[PDB]
Amino acid sequence: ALEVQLELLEKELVNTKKLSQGCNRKRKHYQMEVGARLAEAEVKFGQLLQSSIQCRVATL
């Protein structure tokens, strides 16, 4: 009876293990989606930063 009682607990350890890794798995994609979009924004940010300068340098 004690062996039937034990195996049931470790089945729930697995069910929790799978859904825990499954939630983290969805988060990972979101992180990589936006982290790229932030990288896109910063590149464009640095382009203006120097573009606005090189316009003003020539105007003089």
Partner: protein, 50 residues
Amino acid sequence: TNDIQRDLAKKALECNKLENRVYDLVRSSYEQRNFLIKKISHAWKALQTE
């Protein structure tokens, strides 16, 4: 009191024989059953953290 000393002798000798016969068979099955109980205490403790 002497009637009990006969009983204490006769009965406890039977008890020690019954105990040591059981113990030889059941101390092994105790360890089997008791080491299995410790597995619930760890199977539970991990369950909560998960």
